[PDB]
Design a protein around this ligand. Structure first.
Ligand SMILES: *C(=N)c1nnc(-c2ccccc2)s1
Length: 462
């Protein structure tokens, strides 16, 4: 007898800047999503999440010490002894992934990496750690970043973000044109992102009184991460749940009754106005199920100048599909065709371009012919592929497999073979054997570089 394979799992994400102090004896409220914000229902307390991903910053513990605390905490809550999937530490920045023991044979292709962000001076305590793995047919990635501190350094934080997403090496290395923002079905990025509430320092007491009233609107309108995202300066194409918990920084230790904001020698004579430093964001491939179930902060863990943050997700997953044909051959009953396709690029360059199509549903990636460059009406380069793109041959034709897949697209220069833009198309279509519009934005280094649009026609065995 075998259990069915899951269609959905739940994932816990935690981020906590520990302020170089040991944790208190009990930290279960964190893993229970209890405290302020969007919290988890009490009736779920004994129900284990499938995967727990724990990001720390300013973590003073050894890996062994922290693992023991984490496993004990989850055992107490759930009566389950979790398996360690991965642990990786850079300086005092750490990521731990734990999973239910039933998932040990569902998890494979485990990767870890780190990125150090500074230059000389600025190099040596900020950066990121990450973990990726496959869960059956679904790729999962997780990034814990500790970005540059200081209210006046939002630009440096955005630069840290770009370095991390360029240089963190996770997932399938065959996806060579793609950075981490395209390599995973579900990507979770969290940490002490260190974006601040940008209000005058003389408004400190006003801010605290707003917090005490649980009136966050006029504060969130000045949150640097929200404003930079709105201006497409950082975290393009990521999501974040609405914030309904108090700022998680900077507290006096051993209570939560007081924000410590005034400039001190220990802060480099900087103010630390109350801010949402500690965040969880995500990006999933188009038309995959992902729902945030909790996003909040604990109220009873007081050893640090930050409060822990939790977020939980229901995430769609797929099985490791086997047919009589693929893997190991094509299924001639399946095809993917593209009509009337063109890329619009922001480049000022005039080279020829071709496409690469990458997907787990193909034996290997497919390179197209060169498109035909035209100039658009408002200055743009338009690369026309017409009806010229190849017919893609998936390994499996069953619609229960193929409609759950995605095609990554890179548009590459013929001259340099470098990608000018990356994007993703879902095969979760409204119809098969029917021409339907497709669209993706194209990015490079996580910044918008163009668009790809056209029509698709998918043939399955039904
Ligand atoms: C990370 N260290 C990895 N290197 N290759 C990986 C991979 C291969 C196939 C499918 C997914 C991931 S993971």
């Amino acid at each position: 007898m075998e259990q069915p394979e899951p269609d959905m799992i739940t994932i816990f994400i935690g981020t906590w800047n520990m302020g170089n102090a040991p944790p208190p004896k009990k930290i279960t409220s964190w893993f229970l999503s209890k405290g302020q914000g969007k919290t988890r229902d009490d009736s779920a307390d004994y129900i284990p999440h499938d995967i727990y991903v724990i990001g720390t910053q300013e973590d003073p513990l050894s890996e062994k010490e922290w693992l023991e605390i984490l496993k004990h905490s989850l055992q107490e809550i759930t009566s389950v002894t979790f398996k360690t999937v991965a642990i990786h530490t850079l300086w005092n920045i750490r990521i731990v992934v734990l999973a239910k023991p039933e998932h040990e044979n569902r998890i494979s292709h485990i990767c870890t990496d780190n990125v150090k962000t500074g230059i000389a001076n600025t190099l040596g305590n900020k950066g990121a750690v990450g973990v990726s793995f496959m869960f059956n047919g679904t790729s999962l990635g997780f990034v814990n970043s500790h970005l540059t501190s200081g209210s006046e350094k939002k630009l440096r934080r955005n630069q840290n973000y770009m370095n991390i997403l360029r240089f963190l090496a996770l997932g399938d290395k065959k996806l060579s044109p793609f950075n981490i923002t395209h390599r995973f079905t579900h990507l979770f990025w969290f940490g002490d992102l260190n974006y601040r509430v940008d209000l005058p320092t003389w408004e400190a007491e006003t801010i605290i009184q707003k917090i005490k009233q649980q009136q966050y609107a006029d504060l969130l309108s000045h949150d640097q991460l929200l404003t930079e995202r709105r201006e497409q300066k950082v975290f393009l194409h990521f999501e974040e749940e609405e914030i309904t918990f108090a700022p998680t920084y900077r507290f006096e230790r051993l209570t939560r009754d007081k924000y410590a904001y005034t400039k001190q020698k220990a802060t480099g004579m900087k103010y630390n106005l109350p801010s949402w430093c500690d965040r969880v964001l995500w990006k999933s491939y188009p038309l995959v199920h992902v729902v945030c179930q909790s996003y909040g902060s604990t109220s009873d863990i007081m050893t640090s100048d930050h409060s822990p943050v939790f977020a939980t997700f229901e995430a769609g997953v797929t099985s490791q599909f086997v047919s009589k044909n693929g893997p190991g051959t094509v299924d001639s009953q399946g095809q993917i065709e593209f009509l009337r396709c063109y890329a619009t690029l922001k480049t000022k360059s005039q080279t020829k371009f071709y496409l690469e199509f990458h997907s787990s549903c193909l034996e290997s990636f497919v390179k197209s012919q060169e498109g035909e460059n035209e100039e658009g009406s408002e200055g743009e380069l338009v690369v026309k592929f017409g009806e010229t793109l190849p017919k893609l041959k998936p390994i499996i034709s069953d619609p229960e497999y193929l409609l759950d897949q995605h095609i990554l697209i890179s548009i590459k220069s013929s001259d340099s073979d470098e990608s000018y833009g990356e994007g993703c198309i879902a095969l979760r279509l409204e119809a098969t054997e029917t021409q339907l519009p497709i669209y993706t934005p194209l990015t490079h280094h996580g910044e918008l570089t163009g668009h790809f649009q056209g029509e698709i026609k998918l043939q399955t065995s039904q």
